[PDB]
């Protein structure tokens, strides 16, 4: 666990690469961790992108992954929607995460306005309900938000936004910092009972708890309880 406690899970590709970091990353004392992450960065970032419950937030416009510090403002607000709003179901994984994506948007506004008076284009978070249609409107109102990358300052802000109290833990990993363990393994199992939200929607990267022995004792899906019982 993140608490360190032992757990039995379906050894999916994710839960495998999770055991991985248990042995190589979370095995080391806090200090020496961050250093070791930077050395296996692009590796951990691949295995992150490829087969884990939470993906690397580092995508760019073209499709490839990059550093959060290398994304444009646009690209970030976009990737936020991408990874928290389920397209084919027209829903956010959680209102809180819509707020989040909303607040950062608000920020990009601020970063790119330089005179008092102008109000926000996103005036109510209700606007993000059908997001991708509306978002592009705001982002286009602040042109350069598609030309230049996040301020170092803003990256730091973003990162604290993904941490706030009373928000569902972000469904990805923003970078490999001192908190990478939190980023990775907080609130993990909800994605088992909603693979529709999961990236690619394959259980392959998902966290499902199971005893070692009571795994043969299940052979048919979808048996009504009163039957089994």
């Amino acid at each position: 666990s993140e608490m360190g406690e032992p757990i039995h899970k379906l050894a999916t590709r994710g839960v495998l690469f999770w055991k991985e970091l248990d042995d190589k990353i979370f095995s080391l004392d806090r200090s020496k961790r961050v250093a070791e992450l930077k050395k296996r960065r692009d590796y951990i970032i691949k295995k992150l992108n490829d087969d884990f419950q939470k993906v690397w937030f580092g995508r760019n416009s073209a499709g490839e992954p990059v550093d959060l510090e290398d994304m444009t403002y646009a690209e970030v607000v976009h990737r936020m929607v991408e990874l928290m709003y389920v397209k084919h179901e027209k829903r956010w994984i959680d209102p809180s995460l819509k707020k989040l994506t909303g607040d950062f948007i608000r920020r990009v506004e601020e970063r790119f306005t330089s005179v008092e008076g102008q109000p926000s284009l996103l005036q109510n978070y209700s606007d993000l309900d059908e997001p991708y249609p509306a978002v592009d409107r705001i982002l286009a109102a602040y042109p350069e938000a598609s030309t230049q990358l996040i301020n170092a300052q803003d990256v730091q802000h973003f990162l604290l936004l993904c941490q706030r109290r009373g928000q569902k833990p972000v469904p990805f990993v923003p970078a490999l910092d001192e908190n990478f363990e939190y980023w990775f393994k907080k609130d993990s199992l909800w994605q088992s009972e909603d693979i529709e939200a999961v990236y690619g929607q394959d259980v392959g990267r998902t966290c499902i708890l199971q005893g070692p022995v009571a795994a043969k004792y299940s052979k048919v899906i979808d048996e009504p309880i009163k039957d089994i019982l």
Binding site: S114, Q153, Q156, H157, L159, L160, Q163
Partner: protein, 48 residues
């Protein structure tokens, strides 16, 4: 900025303010609640 426009832009002020040591970046808890960005160098207080 000075030689041409005759005054600083906010962008200018922030650079001056930075190099003169009036403000410095902060990225941790300020009075319990977390915070990141510009802080008055003299008082731990944050600055907008």
């Amino acid at each position: 900025e000075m030689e041409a426009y005759g005054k600083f832009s906010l962008e200018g002020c922030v650079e001056m303010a930075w190099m003169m040591g009036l403000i410095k970046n902060h990225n941790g808890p300020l009075k319990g609640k977390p915070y990141s960005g510009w802080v008055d160098a003299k008082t731990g207080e944050p600055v907008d």
